[PDB]
Amino acid sequence: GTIEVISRENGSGTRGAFTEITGILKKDGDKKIDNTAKTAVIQNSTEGVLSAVQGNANAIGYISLGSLTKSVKALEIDGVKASRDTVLDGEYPLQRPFNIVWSSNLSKLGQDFISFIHSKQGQQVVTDNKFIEAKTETTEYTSQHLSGKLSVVGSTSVSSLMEKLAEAYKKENPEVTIDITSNGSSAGITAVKEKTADIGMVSRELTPEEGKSLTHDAIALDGIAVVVNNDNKASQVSMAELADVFSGKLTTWDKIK
Ligand SMILES: [Cl-]
After folding, report:
1. Regarding beta strands 95-102 and 199-202, do their DSSP bridges make them parallel or antiparallel, or are they unpaired?
2. What residues does the ion ligand 1 have nearby, CB within 5 Å?
């Protein structure tokens, strides 16, 4: 039958990542065109995508990998099954890093917060919040019961996870205030360079120009699962087919072997 493409709402960080990685979001200069199928219906959240795909035998959608449940089926992409292991070793291609960025301006307090994020406790916040931990080496954190304010600015996609990390840190450092500003990766990089943010949040690789004078560090890997209804006999798609389906070029399930 006819493929029912489920898209996330305009401005969604997951939509931005998905369309960029699959090449559906093309730049013909400094103007980006989102080629998402014009027939695609919209869901406003991960829960909404899950409900729509579980509720319709012909539907396909995309969600954060950590949100995958038995109520839907994740497709293999290029014959690779989405998992902690295939995201970590780079076999699974629908993934993006959650980077934090800082400069030589990073305060002692900012450095203590980075140490917490790098610690066994910090890594546990990441995995408990269902993201993948890229780091294999772990350090111990002991609170200095510091005081002061931190400004963390950038990607909306990293904001929720940053909030969880700030909560766990403030439990150990009650006199530390952490402000998290969600705007975008480019605004976060600029804020760090302009010294208006202590730490920036970037949900993609930095360009050579952006990286100048900065250090970046992946605090998490965010995989994206392409999900279908459990009734769907299809189990794998190529990256070409994936882009064809979500751009509305391939519209029937019989074309997917
Ligand atoms: Cl929309």
Report:
1. antiparallel
2. 9-10, 42
Looking at the chain, list the stretches that DSSP marks H as alpha helix, in order from N- to C-terminal side. 13-22, 46-55, 84-88, 108-118, 120-128, 156-172, 185-193, 208-211, 239-246
Phi, psi of 65 (to 5 degrees): -55, -40
Radius of gyration (Cα) for the chain, nearest Å? Answer: 20
d(CA 19, CA 198): 30
**Residue 108: strand, helix, or coil:** helix
Distance 38 CA to ligand 1 centre (A): 11
Domains defined for the chain, CATH in brackets: 1-94+223-257 (3.40.190.10), 95-222 (no CATH)
* Strand 73-74 versus strand 215-228 pairing type: antiparallel
CA distance 113 to 176: 10
* Structure determination method: X-ray
DSSP-derived pairing of the beta strands 59-64 and 4-8 = parallel
Distance from the CA of 94 to the center of ligand 1, in angstroms?
Answer: 22
Q: Quote the ligand 1 centre to 157 CA distance (angstroms).
A: 17
What resolution, expressed in A, was reported for this entry? 1.8
